[PDB]
Design a protein around this ligand. Structure first.
Ligand code: CL
Length: 353
């Protein structure tokens, strides 16, 4: 039967929270029915004293007006750390190295470690938890879009990843944080969990989430990936691309106000009718990037300087420019992926794939 997320398992963690001053790291996805975890805890007479959000606050658009709890955008101040005993993580991730909630989580783990506070992670599925793919990030390229030496698609839940951050000593000053994970039930690393609530505005559906590992690489290029359209992360195109049977024009819309190629007719490819199965078969698929590179004929200027910060190694640009195939390039990282699957194994909380 169906996945039971950590936050649903109140008999597992309500006793942990009893009599404690509680902070929560979450956003609008941290819901069980039409209540935020914050609301459920307050209704059960728990003392929630603060919420940390990677956006403004968790109501999807510095004090929550429904509850009066202070709301803190994301390290935390010393003053804030003193206010609570336990921090709860409850947030829906998408499983990519360049999707940044885990970097916020690592920041909070470091702070909690320094201040001797416990973290409780109410685990949620990784919708891309069914595979591991891409180069391990070279730490020459550590950045705002890549915080740990992990593959592009790491395959782990935030709870698993937290355990790995501790065990591999990936926090600053090599601290470990006291972490308890409430694991999901009815969940393996083959389960294909579908997100009820969009995790970001331009990841509106599962097609976008499944294509994201391949298509977000275009953020290291001038190519539009459909922000400003009905099909974000499900198309690619550019005004200069030539010879294509699909076109779109990005528009200035809420959450995509000043999108790439705004008000330009972009020529390209519609991927929105690929089956979920055929996306799963291919994992990170460099076909799209290679197609656009060769079509545009602008040589190395196709790749933004920070392409490497997204892909995590220097050889992808070089091999594309050298005329190598998608399969050749992808094969180069197979060993990295093999090794990471071994490295992560002690930290998995669910059946491996
Ligand atoms: Cl977005």
């Amino acid at each position: 039967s169906d996945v039971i997320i950590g936050a649903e398992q109140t008999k597992a963690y309500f006793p942990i929270l009893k009599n404690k001053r509680i902070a929560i790291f979450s956003n609008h996805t941290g819901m069980v029915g039409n209540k935020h975890l914050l609301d459920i805890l307050l209704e059960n007479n728990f003392n929630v004293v603060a919420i940390f959000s990677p956006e403004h606050g968790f109501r999807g658009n510095t004090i929550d007006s429904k509850t009066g709890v202070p709301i803190l955008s994301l390290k935390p101040s010393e003053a804030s750390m003193k206010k609570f005993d336990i921090l709860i993580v409850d947030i829906q991730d998408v499983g990519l190295r360049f999707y940044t909630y885990y970097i916020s989580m690592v920041r909070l783990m470091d702070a909690c470690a320094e201040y001797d506070r416990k973290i409780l992670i109410l685990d949620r599925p990784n919708p891309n938890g069914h595979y591991v793919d891409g180069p391990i990030l070279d730490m020459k390229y550590k950045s705002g879009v890549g915080g740990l030496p992990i593959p592009i698609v790491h395959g782990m839940t935030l709870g698993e990843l937290a355990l790995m951050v501790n065990g591999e000593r990936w926090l600053p000053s090599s601290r470990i944080c006291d972490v308890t994970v409430i694991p999901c039930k009815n969940y393996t690393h083959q389960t294909m969990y579908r997100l009820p609530i969009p995790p970001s505005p331009n990841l509106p559906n599962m097609k976008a989430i499944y294509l994201y590992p391949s298509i977000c690489l275009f953020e290291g290029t001038p190519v539009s990936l459909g922000r400003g359209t009905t099909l974000p992360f499900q198309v690619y195109g550019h005004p200069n691309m030539t010879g294509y049977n699909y076109n779109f024009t990005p528009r200035s819309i809420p959450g995509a106000k000043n999108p790439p190629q705004l008000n330009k007719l972009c020529h390209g490819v519609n991927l929105s009718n690929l089956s979920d199965e055929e996306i799963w078969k291919k994992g990170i698929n460099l076909d799209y990037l290679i197609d656009a590179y060769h079509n545009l004929n602008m040589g190395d200027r196709f790749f933004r300087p920070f392409f490497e910060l997204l892909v995590g190694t220097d050889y992808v640009r070089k091999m594309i420019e050298g005329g190598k195939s998608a399969d050749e390039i992808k094969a180069r990282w197979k060993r990295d992926v093999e090794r990471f699957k071994i490295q992560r194994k002690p930290y998995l909380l669910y059946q491996d794939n």
